[PDB]
Structure formats: structure tokens, C-alpha cells
Amino acid sequence: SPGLASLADFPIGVAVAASGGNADIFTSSARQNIVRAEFNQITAENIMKMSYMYSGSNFSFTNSDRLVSWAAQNGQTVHGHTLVWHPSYQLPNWASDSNANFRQDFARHIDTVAAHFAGQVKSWDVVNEALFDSADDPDGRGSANGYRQSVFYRQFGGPEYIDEAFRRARAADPTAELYYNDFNTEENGAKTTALVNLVQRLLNNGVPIDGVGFQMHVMNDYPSIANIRQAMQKIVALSPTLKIKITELDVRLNNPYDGNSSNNYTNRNDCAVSCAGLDRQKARYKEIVQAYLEVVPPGRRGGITVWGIADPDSWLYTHQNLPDWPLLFNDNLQPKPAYQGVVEALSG
Ligand SMILES: [Ca+2]
């Protein structure tokens, strides 16, 4: 073999499904064999989100425990995804502007969840997606010096919930590496600047943040690798020890937002065997992994994770009504040129 994970001294991860469909890691022996062969860390794609930690008002860890156990038995550490996150679909019922005891319930959440997984999960996305993004502002709340005005922001009156989540997480499990995770922060534009402002504030307040996660939900040709590199550079520069992790890497062939509709693959058959996009995708995975290695010093590399095993498993398999092929394995679960691109980056 080898396997990708053997080619690095930092985690090489994959997000796994566990909600009973085709991609479900518990049922798919073919996927389990790929995870065991290739990776040495997993992230729960979905079942470690906030509400999955509850059955009513009480905590329920049955299904997440099952997954964390599976990891330990199959050569995988766990990156735990995620303690605090804003989407309505995964908020526990306590996380409401109508709860007078929000701050108490927030504490109980972080204290209970972090303690529960101590020794079983290497790292956490402690806070996910705290930065404003116009692409993800469905209620039209608008920005607040670059913060998303989520229920956590609204209840706290400010970004202090971020500070508290990291402190509580540190105290409940001192062994975990604690990450702040977000997307579009690799573009090197406004959200990158907002990230700088966020992280610097945490460092100023003495908050126990151990690293920054870049989701890296990228296109083949957007953003430029120069901008990806400079964004990571900007964050590396903020501290002598802050770790950088690539948390959710996937790479689209179709760019809706590029101004060119005639360079869109509109048919599933287009890239089922070969097309120019799969070959660029090899190069794109390679150039990203290379950027990460070059700019993140040895000893501050929190890991590289790809957001799923095989293409039909991807959240972007079909997106905005267009097909895509974002991952390292195809539908038949064969390695793609993308896989080789990761091989060549890691190996040198
Ligand atoms: Ca296009």
C-alpha cells in the first residue's frame, strides 16, 4: 500500500457519514476498508453537531460514542465537529433567544460534551463559523465588526461566547487541541481580515485557542493559490505556536460564480471517465497540500482532512443543480487523479 496517512507526520483525515444512507461508515465495508487503508483520523460529517448530543433536554451520546469507538478500533483519531455552531437545524432546544437560562445551558453544553469525550477525541472545532458571510446570512441580520449575529452572539451581546467556549473546553478536557474553524478565510479578502481581527482578539484576551481550521471548500480555479498561501501566512504570523489545520477540503470543477457559464460541465457523463477538470483537480489538490506544507511550520501542522470518502457521498455531488466530483475516490470507489495529487505533495 502505503496509504496517504503513512506519507505524513500530521493527521490525514476524512469526514465520515453515520446517518444510515449509502455512505454510512457503520454499514459500508468498502468505505471502512478505505478509511483503514488511507486515513488516520476521522471527523463526524454530521453526528457530532450540537443537537445530536441531546434526546429532548437530556444528553445522549449513544451514537457518537459508537463512532468514536469505531475510530479507536480502526486506527483513527477523532476531530470533534463541533461544540458551537449557528445553524437552526442543529441547535439544541435551549439555544433560543426565549431561554432566560441560555448562558447556563451554554456552559452545561461545553462542560458536558468536552468532558465526555476526553481521551477519545484529539481536537475540537470549538467554535465553527463565527465570522459573518453574506453568502450565509439567510435572515439578513448583517455584520457586526465581522461577526455573525448568531443566537450565541445575540445572547452574549458580543463575541465573548467564543472566549468562554474555549475556556470551558480547555478546563473540561485539557488534552484536546482547540480550534477555531471557518470557510472562505482562504480567499485572502474581507473574511480573512475579519479572521485576523477575531484571532488577535482571542490572543489579546489570553484565550486558550490552539489553532485555526481552514475548511478549504475550494474551486478548481478559485481562489488563487497565491491568495490561499497568503491567508494561511497571515494566520501563522499571529503567534509562535498557533496550529493550522485544513479541516474540510474538497475541490469543485464547476464554478458558478466565475462569470462564465460556457465552461460549466452540465452533464454527469462529462467527467465520469476523463475531462480537463479531473486533471486540474489533481494539480489543485497537489498545490494546496504543497502550500500548507510550505507555509505551516513543522510542529504546527494540525492536519489535512478531506470532506468525505467518495464523490457520491459529497455535499457537493449535486449542488445548485449541477453535478460535481469533489473528492479523492469516485463513485465506484476508485482513486482519482486527485488522490495522486495528494500523494505527490506529501511525498515531495
Ligand atoms: Ca463557470
Curated annotation (Swiss-Prot):
Gene Ontology molecular function, alphabetical = cellulose binding; endo-1,4-beta-xylanase activity
Q: Which residues form the GH10 domain?
A: 19-345
The UniProt catalytic activity note for this protein reads: Endohydrolysis of (1->4)-beta-D-xylosidic linkages in xylans
Provide this UniProt record's keywords sorted from A to Z: Carbohydrate metabolism, Disulfide bond, Glycosidase, Hydrolase, Polysaccharide degradation, Signal, Xylan degradation
Q: Which GO terms describe its biological process?
A: xylan catabolic process
Q: What is its EC number?
A: 3.2.1.8
* Pathway annotation: Glycan degradation; xylan degradation
Carries keyword tRNA processing?
no
Q: Which ranges of the sequence are coiled-coil? A: none
Which residues catalyse the reaction? E129 (proton donor), E248 (nucleophile)
User: What does the sequence similarity comment in the record state about its family?
Assistant: Belongs to the glycosyl hydrolase 10 (cellulase F) family.
Protein name in UniProt = Endo-1,4-beta-xylanase A
Give the source species. Answer: Cellvibrio japonicus (strain Ueda107) (Pseudomonas fluorescens subsp. cellulosa)
Q: What gene name is given for the protein in this entry?
A: xynA
Of the parent protein, the shown chain spans: 265 to 610 of 611
